Every structure is written in C-alpha cells, then in structure tokens.
Amino acid sequence: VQFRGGTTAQHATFTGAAREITVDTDKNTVVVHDGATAGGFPLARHDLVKTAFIKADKSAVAFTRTGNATASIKAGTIVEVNGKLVQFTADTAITMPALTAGTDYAIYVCDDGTVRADSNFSAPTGYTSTTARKVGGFHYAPGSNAAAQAGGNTTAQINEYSLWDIKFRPAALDPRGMTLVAGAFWADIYLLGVNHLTDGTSKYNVTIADGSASPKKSTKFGGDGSAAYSDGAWYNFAEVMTHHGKRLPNYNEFQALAFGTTEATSSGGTDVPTTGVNGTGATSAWNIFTSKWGVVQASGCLWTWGNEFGGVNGASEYTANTGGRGSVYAQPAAALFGGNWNSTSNSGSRAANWNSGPSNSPANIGARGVCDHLIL
Amino acid sequence: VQFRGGTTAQHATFTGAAREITVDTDKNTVVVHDGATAGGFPLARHDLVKTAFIKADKSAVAFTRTGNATASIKAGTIVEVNGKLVQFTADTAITMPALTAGTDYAIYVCDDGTVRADSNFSAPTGYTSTTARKVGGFHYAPGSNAAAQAGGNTTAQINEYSLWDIKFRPAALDPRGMTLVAGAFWADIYLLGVNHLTDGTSKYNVTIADGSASPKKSTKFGGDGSAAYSDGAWYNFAEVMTHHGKRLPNYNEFQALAFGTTEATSSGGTDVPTTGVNGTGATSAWNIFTSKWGVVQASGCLWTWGNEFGGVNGASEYTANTGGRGSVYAQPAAALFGGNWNSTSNSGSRAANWNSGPSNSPANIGARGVCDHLIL
Amino acid sequence: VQFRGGTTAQHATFTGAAREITVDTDKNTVVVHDGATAGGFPLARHDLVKTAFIKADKSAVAFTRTGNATASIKAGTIVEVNGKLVQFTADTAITMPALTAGTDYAIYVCDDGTVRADSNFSAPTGYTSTTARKVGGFHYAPGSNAAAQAGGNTTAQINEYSLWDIKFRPAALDPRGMTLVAGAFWADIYLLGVNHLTDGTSKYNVTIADGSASPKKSTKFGGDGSAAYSDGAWYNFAEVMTHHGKRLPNYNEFQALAFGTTEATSSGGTDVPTTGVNGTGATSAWNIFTSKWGVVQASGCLWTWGNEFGGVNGASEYTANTGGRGSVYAQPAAALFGGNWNSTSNSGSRAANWNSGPSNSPANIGARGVCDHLIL
Ligand SMILES: [Mg+2]
Ligand SMILES: [Mg+2]
Ligand SMILES: [Mg+2]
Ligand SMILES: [Mg+2]
Ligand SMILES: [Mg+2]
C-alpha cells in the first residue's frame, strides 16, 4: 500500500481534504491536511529529536542518592537512546557495579529500558556506546560529607553533591571528581595532583602538586606530556586550571566550598603528600577536613592559590620572576586560602594569607579547581 | 483500519515501497518508506518535544513592554503547553491583573491560546500548573527607570529590563526582582533584606540587611531558618549571595548597574532602613537614586560590599577575625561601592572605599546581588 | 482518502486497535494506537523542531580547518533550514568566497544541502536569510597563529580557534573577531578600537583606543554614537566592554590568551597606532606578538587594562577622580598586562604593572575584551 505523495513544491499549493495524509517524498515525512491550509502540516522526523533528554525539574540533577551505595533516576525523565524512547514514570533504581573508594562512575540509560552505572566512561559492561547513552555520573568518595562542622568519616559512599547529568554539570569539559557547592558552582573534590593530564585535576590517592612537586606542564601551553614546571608558581597552577576549563577559587568560593571542615585545625606533622590520605606525621586524619560538599582536605593541609590579588606588594621596580614571560611592577600577592599542615589554629574555611607573590614556590602551597555550574 | 507493522528489528532490513507508511510497534510511531533506504524514516513522537519553547530572536527576551502597565509576547513565539502547540504569529497583548507597586509577576501561556500575568508563580487565576505554562515574568517597580543621570520618578510601572523568560534570564535559580544591566548581566533591583530566605534577596519595602541588622543565616551553611548571623561581615553577605546563586558586584558591574543614579549625592538624614522607600530624615527621595536599569537605591543610600579585594591591608600577622573559621595575614580590604546616606558628595556609581577589612560590620554597609545572564 | 479523526477530548478515552492511525483535528497531527493505551501516541509537528541544530560532538565546534583557506563541516551534523533536513554524514567541504586578510566570515547551511561561507552576515550570495541558515563563522587572519613562542607569520589564513557555531561560541552577543583560548574562554583577536560601536570591539586595521584616543562613548551609558569619552580611564574601557557583553582580562586569562607571543620583547619605536599592523618606528613586526590562539599584538604593543585591583594605592582620602561619579578612598591600581612598545624586555604574556589607578589615561594603555565560552 502506497499513499498519495509528491515534492514539497507540489505540496505548497495543495489544500487536501480534512484528515487526508500524504507523503512528502523530498522530506520522507507525512503531511496532515485539514482541507483549508495550503501546504498542510508536515510531521517531524526522528532525526531532529535524537539526543533528546528531558527532565521534570530542569534546575536539579536527574538522580537521587538513596543510600551509601544506591541511587535512582528521577520520575518524568525521558531519554532518546539508539532510536528508542526510554522513559521512567516513577523513580527507578540504578544498577550498580562494585563500588571502590575514590572512583568516578558514569550513569547510562540503555536501549532496553534499564539504567546502570559503570567505572568505564565509554560504555557500561555488556553494552556499547550506541546501545547505552552516557547521561551522567557521580563520585564514590573515600568518606562521608560533613554533617556539621567537624569533617566527615572514612566510610566510602556516594557524594550526593557530586551527581551530575549532561544538562546539570560542571562547565569544565571533564565533570569527574567535582562537587556542587551550595547549588552555586563546582569545586574539585581533591587538591591538584602532579599527574593531572592523565588523571584529571581531581583524583583520590595521588601525589599532590606543590612548590617542591610541580605539576605536569600543560600540553595546551608548550608541554609535551612528560615535562613538569620547574616550580609551583601561581602562574603554573593557574595555567593548569585553564587547561582543564577551571580556575582557582576566589574568597567567596573558598569559604563556601570549605564550609563543614574542622575549623581552626591543621593536619600537623611535616607534610601532606597525597590526596585523601593521612599526612606525614599528621595529628589529624584526612577526614577531619572534609567539607559539607565532600571537598577533601578542604582546609588545614595545603594552601590553595586563589584567583584574586591584594595584600603585600613586591618591589616597585620591574622584576623578572614570571618564568621568562615579562616583568612585574608593584606586583600584589596572590591569595592563599585554607591554611596548611603547619598552620595550627590559623587554618579554616576563611583562612587567608596575602603575603606571597605569584612567583613563590614553597612546599606548602598547591591548588584546587573550581568552575561554573552549567544548566542546559 | 490497521496498518502494516512490525518491530524495529523487522524494520531494519525492510526496504518497502515509495510512499509506504508502516507502524513500528516497539516505538509506537509511523515509519515512512522511499523504496530504497533500509530502515525507512521513523517519525518523532510528541513526548520528545514537550517543553518546546521557540523564539524568533533567541538572544532577546520573549516580551515587549508597551506601556507603564501593558506588555506583549513577541511574534514568532511557539510554546508547547499540555499537548497543544500555542503560537503567536503577531505581537499579542498579555492579559494583566491588578498591578501593585514593587511586585513580581509571572507570565503564562495557557492551552486555550491566551497569555496572561499573575502575582502567583505556580498558576494564574482560573488555571492550573498543567493548563498554564510559566514562561517568564517581570517586576512592576514603584518608579520609573532613569531616563538620564538624575534617577527616576515615583510612578509605578513595568521595568522593561526586568523582563525575563525561561531561556533569557538570571542564572540564579530565582529570577525574581532582578534587572538586566546593559544586556551583560543581572542585578538585584533591591538591596539585600534581612529576611532573604522567605523573600529572596531582592524585595520592595523590606528591612535592609547591614552590619547592625544581620541577614538570616543561610540554611545551606548551618542555618536553621530563624537565626541571623552574629554579625554582618563581608563573609556573611558573600555567603548569602552564594546561597541564592548570586555574588557581590565587582567594580565593572557596579558602575554599570548604578549608571543613571544622581551622582555625587547622598540620601542624607540618619539611616536607610527600608528598600524602595525614603530614608530616615532623608534630604533626597529614594527615586533620586534609581539607575537606568531600575536598580533602586543604586548609590548614596548604603554601601554594598563587593567581590574584589585591594587597598588598605590589615596587620601582617595572623589575625583571628573570620568568626572562628581561621585567621588572615595582611588581609586586604573588601571593596565598598556606591556610598551611603552619610557620604555627601562622595557617593555615586563609581564611589569606592577600600579601607574596610571583610571582618568589619557597620550599620552603613549592606549588599546587592548580581549574577550571570543565561541564554538557553 | 480521509482518515478517522476527532478532537483531543474524543481521543482521550479512545483506545483504538493495534497499528491504527487517526488524525487529531485540533492538533493537525497523527496519533498512533496500540490497542491498550488510552489517548494513543501523538506524533510531533515539524513546527516544534524548527531551529534544530545537532552535532555529534556538542563540546567541540561544528567545523574543521583543513588548510589556510579551506574548511569542512563535520560528520553527524544535522541542520533544519527552511523546512528541509540537511545532514552531513561525512566531513563536507565549505564553499569559500575570496578571502581577505583581517575579515570575519559567516558559515551558512542552505536548503539545497550546500554549505558556504560569506563576508555577509545576513545571507550568502545567491540566497536569502530564509534559504540560508547562519550556523557559525570564523576569522580569516592576517597571519598564522604561533606554532611555538616566537609569534606567527604574515600569511593570511583561517584561524582554527576563531571557528564558532551557534551552540559553541563567545557568550558575547557578537562572536566576531574572537578566538577560543585553550578551550576555556574567548578573547578579542584585536585590541579595542575607537570606533567599536560600528566595528565591534575586535577589528583589523583600525585605530586603537587608548588614553590619548578615547573610545566612542557607549550608547548604553549616555552616549549619542558620535562622541568619545573625555578620556581613556579604566572606567571607560570597562564600560565599553560591558556594552559588548565582555570584560577586561584578569591575570589568569591574560597569561593564557597571550601565550605564544615572543616573550621579553616589545614593538619598539614610538607608537602602536593600529591593530594588526606594524608600529611606528617598530624594531619588531606586528606578527612577532601573535599568540598561539591568534591574538594579535598580544604583548609588547599596548598595555591592556585588567579586571582586577591591587598593588599601589591612591591616597587614603576621598578623591573625586571618577569623571564626576563619586569619590574613591585608598583606590588600588587596576592591573595593566602585556607591556607596551616602549617596555623593552619587560613585555610578555605575564608582564604586569600595578602602579596605575583607574583614573589614569596615558597613550600606552588600551584594552582587550574577553568573555565566557558558551555551549548550548
Ligand atoms: Mg608535597
Ligand atoms: Mg578579582
Ligand atoms: Mg539598617
Ligand atoms: Mg594610540
Ligand atoms: Mg584584587
């Protein structure tokens, strides 16, 4: 059985009968007629609404944490996947793999109507990237978010604030290892690691970048992937954040992201070499410094450079201290936030030092990334 | 009458005839065939294009102010509402309720084809949230925007710059009580009120938050909804803005949002207790300080804290003045913008004081919120 | 031949037979039935998916530079244009006009399946804005981007980083003359010109705005379109940037956008009057200062004002130096970045001077705009 048809040009001056259906052979679609409107009413092909992802609440993430190891996709969520229309009329549980402390997971809605998480960010086990659509993810932290203002524990669990979807997420290209602070912006859960090109900026249980362990040189700014910076200047850490679509925090962002940490308390000892791990000779465990949003080592471990200048100035003469990229005159300090392991009672969510010019490279300054919250 | 149909798998190898219409029984949609392409051309179900909202000009708001109390939705606006395609081929009047000075209104496109405003932000009177779709809103201000640089008047009217829609709006979750400054970013029409949890940050005829009338403690940072901060430090104002998805202005934003105010002039008297209302003993009326964008009390009434540091530093010694959240070293002032009622000829759209550390909490400093402009 | 049909209310209780197709006469669409679900499964009209623009990779631009004067639209790109569905299953060459050094081009997808560029931003030659849909563009630069840190050449060619599309672009309303820096944010290729209202902020071979040649007064802040500012204070440049949906760069942005320039080198001579052109008496050619991203005269030519305050303060005494818009107390310097033609070895991608208050207006300070990267 074939229906009445013709080109779009033939349809343009065609007022059919009421309830007549024809086929536009140029467009390969149906045109409905009403016996009055010339041209009729063409229907949409599926090609145009592929990649459709609709949520009932566009200003909230698509998933809900229901327990330490469990989560659900929300009701009224519709996801086009592999030509199919997969929807969830009620809250539906997400099928989890084995969960391992300090690991990021992707959530997929598959063409068979199921929803599931996986450590693989191309495709979940038993599927391909065609039959399973990556729609979001979360971080499975090594410890809880702070319930009050005394840090958290060492019980691994899903960080509820780390839940992102493809329309509710970090603006940074890579959303992994980040958490949403008070609904306003995202922060890296972990301090920047040396090997941030392969690991991303925010990873559990890696060597922390600082003035004595400089980060890998950005491949977007002359790095080859092996080379590191010679030191931990503000300039270098800032460059690394730009590489990853992030920036260093300002004071408003830092006090927000670090809230929940144990205030006026430092790690103690002689160093904090590693993210999410007790420091060298430390008197407080890493989890003492977990913020309400699951920011790990949020204060009292290492200063983070900040994206703000002020305080003590350098010399009022040109000083070539930018790694060979010009000189500075009356250069103000770049902000340092949080305090370090040796700061005793000066550390906190509002701890700030404005005595270091951006060229300084001590062992006790690293960096934490932040970025804008993106709704699509 | 029933049509030839099968599963998607049966359709995959099926190359029918030209102008053949079949039914995919898995997708419950029509598949047009051309007698050549295997699989055919599946058509889109309506579920995938619910929440459709299309504007002719995506880089501008969907509505136009046509007078003090009237507005239209723009031609070429298509709006899906409860199954129905509602479109406006010409500029169409919005049905208005009684308009009350200093009130925010929501605009709805209803399934009967009408468009109407209402002070209720769930549903207009005579409709529900299902038969009426909130697509935007505006602020009906207590006075005019400034036509030049001498403030405005006291004739209540729609603020054209306060018009927002669901794809042209403040990035902050709550778009109410904000105005678009020079197309670049949004600013709170009103200074922050004490009771901002219930009122939002920007509300007419409320008590202003300052150093001697601290804002309600953010419920995202340890507040219970009843208690206020112990004082009105920069820290607390910045936190309140973060809560609401906003920030304090920088100097570039402040001069823009305040342009149109009466420069080098202050409210006079002894206080400015209330938004959108004359100050206590004021020698200038409140409307003298309305900006071009309809920012009320934009200068010369109360300083706003700013999101920028510099100027005079605190001691080059660790100072525990952050409300118990660490110490600061060589802490630069946080900018103050605009001047207060007591600032005589120092006030204006570029008035700035950089002698106040963030720990200061005076009766003459409050806050005004800003946030990014969001196009979707 | 007419099909069974009725209103939407009649369709509500109607459960048809499997594979039945009726016509909703209110919606003028087809409803597929399955013999169980009441209401059936309505199909979408084409009206709801007009403006459809879909890319395989939504986190990258839709085009690829394939040579100095050639480019292609990417595989998997689907564009609605004038009723048609135009798709490119493989990388498809863009038809180019004559390309002229220092010119912006728009890319159009047309309703005959062709893709083409044109210097005209309303429609390409041989088409209208109805039969040709503007979906992006690029800058054809007067010389290459920097391959390393010695600037670029003077071979006119497409700047790969200046490629934008309608869903991958500067947040600023006008995306022309900008380039994407490290995937993170957009920068003006050229320093701000005097005639920025008609030219945009970023244009080749125009007079550069600075303290001795003030920019046109913004028409959003009291300008008539002919008058220039009384001087080139920070305030005026910041206002111009706000007008165009941009801002001055912070330190993190400046070091990123200028990377690739010839470091510790200045233009020399007595002046740099013009964008993309050798300075007056210059000892280094303009292209020596082209950055990796194709930012022209990125360092060593004129200082840019920055959107950050610190360093040397003005008097701790109210000073009326804001052009009649209030007074400032302890005003910190506004950052200057890059060095100017007379800065010898002090110039570079991290050159900074914090000794000029915002009220200063010398011949060697101009401005460069930046804005956020927008993905839709
Ligand atoms: Mg270390
Ligand atoms: Mg700043
Ligand atoms: Mg008060
Ligand atoms: Mg000049
Ligand atoms: Mg500063």
mmCIF file of C-alpha atoms and ligand atoms in Angstrom, chain A residues 250 307-308, chain B residues 250 307-308, chain C residues 250 307-308, ligand 2:
data_model
loop_
_atom_site.group_PDB
_atom_site.id
_atom_site.type_symbol
_atom_site.label_atom_id
_atom_site.label_comp_id
_atom_site.label_asym_id
_atom_site.label_seq_id
_atom_site.Cartn_x
_atom_site.Cartn_y
_atom_site.Cartn_z
ATOM 1 C CA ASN A 250 38.187 33.384 44.935
ATOM 2 C CA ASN A 307 42.212 33.805 41.698
ATOM 3 C CA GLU A 308 42.499 37.199 43.399
ATOM 4 C CA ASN B 250 32.851 43.893 41.155
ATOM 5 C CA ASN B 307 33.592 40.794 45.262
ATOM 6 C CA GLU B 308 37.066 42.300 44.982
ATOM 7 C CA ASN C 250 42.152 39.018 34.713
ATOM 8 C CA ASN C 307 39.545 43.431 35.581
ATOM 9 C CA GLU C 308 41.490 43.159 38.836
HETATM 10 MG MG MG D 2 39.159 39.875 41.431
#
